Amino acid sequence: EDVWEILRQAPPSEYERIAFQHGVTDLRGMLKRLK
Numbered sequence: 001e002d003v004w005e006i007l008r009q010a011p012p013s014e015y016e017r018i019a020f021q022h023g024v025t026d027l028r029g030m031l032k033r034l035k
Contacts, residue, residue, distance in 0.1 A: 007034050 003022045007030065010018055019027045 003030055004033055007031065 003019050003024045006018045007015055015027055015031065019025070019030060024030055
């Protein structure tokens, strides 16, 4: 349900669409936590 959780299975093109939906602006930091 979270951005980190969704990013795992979500396409890279929708990483902004998921992040912004949850009010996450630091996608890069989220993707550092992803990998």
